[PDB]
Design a protein around this ligand. Sequence first.
Ligand SMILES: *CCC1=C(C)C(=O)N/C1=C\c1[nH]c(/C=C2\N=C(C[C@H]3NC(=O)C([C@H](*)C)=C3C)C(C)=C2CCC(=O)O)c(CCC(=O)O)c1C
Ligand SMILES: *CCC1=C(C)C(=O)N/C1=C\c1[nH]c(/C=C2\N=C(C[C@H]3NC(=O)C([C@H](*)C)=C3C)C(C)=C2CCC(=O)O)c(CCC(=O)O)c1C
Ligand SMILES: *[C@@H](C)[C@H]1/C(=C/C2=NC(=C\c3[nH]c(C[C@H]4NC(=O)C(C=C)=C4C)c(C)c3CCC(=O)O)/C(CCC(=O)O)=C2C)NC(=O)[C@@H]1C
Ligand SMILES: *[C@@H](C)[C@H]1/C(=C/C2=NC(=C\c3[nH]c(C[C@H]4NC(=O)C(C=C)=C4C)c(C)c3CCC(=O)O)/C(CCC(=O)O)=C2C)NC(=O)[C@@H]1C
Ligand SMILES: *[C@@H](C)[C@H]1/C(=C/C2=NC(=C\c3[nH]c(C[C@H]4NC(=O)C(C=C)=C4C)c(C)c3CCC(=O)O)/C(CCC(=O)O)=C2C)NC(=O)[C@@H]1C
Ligand SMILES: *[C@@H](C)[C@H]1/C(=C/C2=NC(=C\c3[nH]c(C[C@H]4NC(=O)C(C=C)=C4C)c(C)c3CCC(=O)O)/C(CCC(=O)O)=C2C)NC(=O)[C@@H]1C
Ligand SMILES: *[C@H](C)[C@H]1/C(=C/C2=NC(=C\c3[nH]c(C[C@H]4NC(=O)C(C=C)=C4C)c(C)c3CCC(=O)O)/C(CCC(=O)O)=C2C)NC(=O)[C@@H]1C
Ligand SMILES: *[C@H](C)[C@H]1/C(=C/C2=NC(=C\c3[nH]c(C[C@H]4NC(=O)C(C=C)=C4C)c(C)c3CCC(=O)O)/C(CCC(=O)O)=C2C)NC(=O)[C@@H]1C
Lengths: 163, 163, 64, 64
Amino acid sequence: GKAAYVGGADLQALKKFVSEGNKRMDSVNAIVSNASCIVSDSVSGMVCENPSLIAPNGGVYTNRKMAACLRDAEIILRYVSYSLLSGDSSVLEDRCLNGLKETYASLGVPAAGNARTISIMKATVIGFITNNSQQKKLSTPAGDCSALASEVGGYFDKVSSAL
Amino acid sequence: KAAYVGGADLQALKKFVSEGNKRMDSVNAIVSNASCIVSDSVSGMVCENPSLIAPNGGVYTNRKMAACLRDAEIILRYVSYSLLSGDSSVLEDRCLNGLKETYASLGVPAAGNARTISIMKATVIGFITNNSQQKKLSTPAGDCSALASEVGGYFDKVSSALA
Amino acid sequence: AMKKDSKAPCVEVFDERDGCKAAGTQKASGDDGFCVKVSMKAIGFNAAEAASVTKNYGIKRFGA
Amino acid sequence: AMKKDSKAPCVEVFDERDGCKAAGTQKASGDDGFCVKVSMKAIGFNAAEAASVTKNYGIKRFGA
Ligand SMILES: *CCC1=C(C)C(=O)N/C1=C\c1[nH]c(/C=C2\N=C(C[C@H]3NC(=O)C([C@H](*)C)=C3C)C(C)=C2CCC(=O)O)c(CCC(=O)O)c1C
Ligand SMILES: *CCC1=C(C)C(=O)N/C1=C\c1[nH]c(/C=C2\N=C(C[C@H]3NC(=O)C([C@H](*)C)=C3C)C(C)=C2CCC(=O)O)c(CCC(=O)O)c1C
Ligand SMILES: *[C@@H](C)[C@H]1/C(=C/C2=NC(=C\c3[nH]c(C[C@H]4NC(=O)C(C=C)=C4C)c(C)c3CCC(=O)O)/C(CCC(=O)O)=C2C)NC(=O)[C@@H]1C
Ligand SMILES: *[C@@H](C)[C@H]1/C(=C/C2=NC(=C\c3[nH]c(C[C@H]4NC(=O)C(C=C)=C4C)c(C)c3CCC(=O)O)/C(CCC(=O)O)=C2C)NC(=O)[C@@H]1C
Ligand SMILES: *[C@@H](C)[C@H]1/C(=C/C2=NC(=C\c3[nH]c(C[C@H]4NC(=O)C(C=C)=C4C)c(C)c3CCC(=O)O)/C(CCC(=O)O)=C2C)NC(=O)[C@@H]1C
Ligand SMILES: *[C@@H](C)[C@H]1/C(=C/C2=NC(=C\c3[nH]c(C[C@H]4NC(=O)C(C=C)=C4C)c(C)c3CCC(=O)O)/C(CCC(=O)O)=C2C)NC(=O)[C@@H]1C
Ligand SMILES: *[C@H](C)[C@H]1/C(=C/C2=NC(=C\c3[nH]c(C[C@H]4NC(=O)C(C=C)=C4C)c(C)c3CCC(=O)O)/C(CCC(=O)O)=C2C)NC(=O)[C@@H]1C
Ligand SMILES: *[C@H](C)[C@H]1/C(=C/C2=NC(=C\c3[nH]c(C[C@H]4NC(=O)C(C=C)=C4C)c(C)c3CCC(=O)O)/C(CCC(=O)O)=C2C)NC(=O)[C@@H]1C
């Protein structure tokens, strides 16, 4: 119920405990430093492939419903960013996904829309981690982050499957 | 602390400045896009003169670059307040008075400042006149030529004070 | 005079004519859905954005 | 369980190996310039970003 600050020997142990610690911190940093554009580009992509989502009484018609959806995409992205930091999905599973499928069935949050937002978020995050992003590149030493792109891909897939 | 102007308070304000409704959209366009305006203008400064980020150049190292980005936002925000109120007295007194002399002390290069300001000016005017290419304003369509000339004049005030 | 404290007027413009209201935000008298907020805030340093511009300044974005 | 509280883990990653330090931010001990901060925060609604997506979803950006 407070902020955790991890540095010094605490962080050195965390970074030995996870695989590829230094590249992993860069990967986390890429997600959280670009969180707003990742979310907006993915939800925008949802809509432009299916613009009836923003037609009257569609899923994200009106600013309140669109705002709730952008908020949810960010929540999900941040649980994924924490899974990549820690390298396990326990917290994503128990505190974000657990019961979420049933919530969205009652509220009328359509599944095909969510799955596209998630796939675009996954594609966008992988593009950053692999420096295939075109408007912005990461400021890191050059190298191969393919293993970490795969792993974060699995966290997103867990979300997709859960929904 | 914060002042809030609405209802009858705000209705009379939109009456003492010209084109109240388009004016408020114009202010909202500046502040809602403050980060991209600032970052595209400082970036263009550097891509036009990349020696600004070479060793001991004006925005070499993150601290100097961060300070410059900060100043560009400060200046952009004093201009947004000028467009809101229809005059430049606060910009002149609280932002420009003493600033050229502070910059010549710290060696902040005038050539670079002049270019940051010109791109921020071109960017704001582009938004207000529907010449922005990635994102448009969510407004009724029409002509905002007069308000583009006015905000241009406030930017021109900054350029002359720092030239 | 410019005070060297980084503080600038932060303007917020609100258009809530769709009627959606947030608990704890009726800071002024009115029901037509319009409001303008102004506060003076110290503008902060953003190292992340600084790093990004240093790396990425040479990329043309937004169809500029 | 998902609590419907809108709270998510907000991770911030710091690399301050250039030596630059902001007053008041030294919350942990170390000698290498690295820090990770984690907190749970409620993710808020952003009407301005909602407005922008509603208007601009059909424009391809970023070389995407
Ligand atoms: C706020 C970001 C933005 C969105 C979103 C959008 O739709 N347009 C946006 C910004 C914008 N920029 C300009 C104009 C210029 N931008 C630059 C800097 C970039 N040019 C480079 O060569 C470069 C380094 C490689 C940059 C980075 C420049 C130089 C301009 C022109 C300034 C001038 O003197 O005319 C605009 C204005 C309209 C346009 O597309 O030019 C906008 C809206
Ligand atoms: C965070 C913004 C960003 C920057 C900055 C950058 O450099 N790259 C960025 C984002 C990014 N997006 C993608 C991939 C996709 N984006 C979309 C949505 C847009 N496509 C549309 O058709 C549409 C409406 C007209 C959009 C808005 C889509 C569909 C994708 C591909 C996803 C998929 O097909 O599964 C990436 C990935 C790399 C790339 O360039 O595609 C990135 C980095
Ligand atoms: C419904 C959920 C909407 C939405 C509403 C929000 N408004 C937020 C802040 C806010 N709104 C106003 C304007 C309002 N207050 C007034 O006094 C009057 C006119 C007399 C009106 C038109 C103000 C002044 C404020 C700031 C309150 C303050 O000074 O602290 C708000 C908070 C945003 C956040 O916490 O991130 C919300 C959520 N937002 C949405 O997405 C839907 C469409
Ligand atoms: C995919 C992730 C990227 C890519 C990442 C690489 N980073 C490499 C080395 C590296 N990164 C850091 C900073 C990181 N460590 C931390 O503790 C934190 C903050 C808490 C940060 C943000 C460091 C210190 C290092 C090693 C030392 C250095 O060179 O300064 C790296 C080299 C291989 C490796 O170290 O395993 C890579 C490949 N590189 C890419 O090309 C994509 C886009
Ligand atoms: C250049 C500025 C733009 C352009 C702007 C236009 N806005 C027009 C009418 C209008 N705008 C608002 C919202 C505005 N008024 C407020 O009080 C506040 C918040 C405090 C804001 C955000 C309203 C309520 C209106 C009234 C008309 C309506 O609801 O449709 C407008 C029509 C001409 C005029 O009213 O003077 C224009 C042209 N339009 C463009 O194409 C560029 C990009
Ligand atoms: C010098 C002006 C730099 C710059 C520094 C800033 N850091 C800011 C926040 C911050 N930094 C850390 C990491 C630091 N604290 C530690 O305990 C250790 C390791 C043991 C390190 C590496 C943290 C944890 C934080 C957040 C503090 C908190 O959450 O209470 C910061 C933000 C201040 C603001 O918002 O204005 C700054 C400016 N930033 C720059 O641009 C230059 C390059
Ligand atoms: C960016 C386009 C420039 C660039 C800007 C730099 N400014 C630096 C320090 C600085 N800036 C101000 C003025 C600022 N503070 C205010 O209170 C207001 C208005 C109310 C403004 C616009 C001051 C007072 C200072 C020094 C004190 C401080 O930072 O709080 C700066 C660092 C200079 C240094 O470390 O000596 C830079 C790099 N530099 C460039 O090359 C481009 C053209
Ligand atoms: C965006 C890609 C979707 C879309 C999203 C919507 N979600 C809406 C309400 C809502 N979302 C949640 C789950 C959210 N809250 C949490 O605490 C967590 C995890 C910790 C998450 C993932 C809840 C509990 C709720 C209802 C309560 C609330 O909004 O705070 C929503 C509004 C639904 C309504 O008005 O009944 C939307 C529009 N909608 C779409 O069409 C796309 C596909």
